[PDB]
Symmetry: C6
Subunit: 67 residues, 6 copies
């Protein structure tokens, strides 16, 4: 595959503001600083570590290309 | 098997609008752009990346065949 | 084992209407069209694909035998 | 190990009414008919299949011994 | 490692009353009777079996040492 | 990789107060005492054991460096 890495890499490279919705409906915002297979580092005031198992959808704030 | 891939492939191929309900009850809509074993790319204004672990049911907006 | 397959197979074979409760408390209804180890295809108007990780309990609408 | 099997086996053998609380706070009741590593069959009017990943706690309605 | 076993073992040995918060926000209380890698047996009136996948945090009711 | 360990190690070393949001929206606070791949020990009055599967995001109360 796989689809995650190029999607997230594009967001990180272009420094696209994103909305990350968590499995509880709470929305987080910022720019994807780095990621691996378990977490995303989400930046603005501080870097916060978001567990992928808690994420429902990642929504870019503007159209982003990759594949 | 397996049932997922042909179901999602049919939706993607026929460009069938779908409703994706997440484990928190929130409903997402659009067309399935691509998928793998971990995420679905869901399109309309922007492509958003939906984690399969956060999805409860995928509901096509009209009858779709595959198997 | 295992208990899942004969329980779900019986429901599918006898075309027993079932209630599927999801981990968020939302109830889905219909007849089990097919399943594997990851999803259930639940039919009535359209087939919808239900992720087993999102299901809490499967409730037949009438007594069903298998084992 | 392991602790699950003797606890659930005792409940099943003694036909002890149990309360099964699901991860969403909904309470189910009945007697444990059978189980494996993925589901519990919970009986009263009909047998319902409860996914262990959706269960939070199993509460016997009276003191039960095993180990 | 690992951190779980000595933390839970200390609680069990010292028979420290604990609060177990579940992933849905519901609080359970009692003393940890036994545990393994999948469940905790939580005692007071009856022993109840708590699935670790449903637990969010284990809060001792008083300071407990181990490591 | 991997990103978790250096992020959490920095927080633990610098004894940075953190907010840990759980998958249910409840916020926990304190200082990260120790962690492994399954839990975080979160300190203030008592040490509490937080299951990583129940955590959504870890938010430092001030900017923290590592990588």
């Amino acid at each position: 595959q796989s689809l995650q890495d190029p999607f997230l890499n594009a967001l990180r490279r272009e420094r696209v503001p994103v909305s990350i919705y968590l499995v509880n409906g709470i929305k987080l915002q910022g720019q994807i600083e780095s990621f691996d297979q378990f977490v995303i580092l989400l930046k603005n005031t501080v870097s916060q570590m978001v567990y992928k198992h808690a994420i429902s959808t990642v929504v870019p704030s503007r159209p982003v290309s990759h594949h």
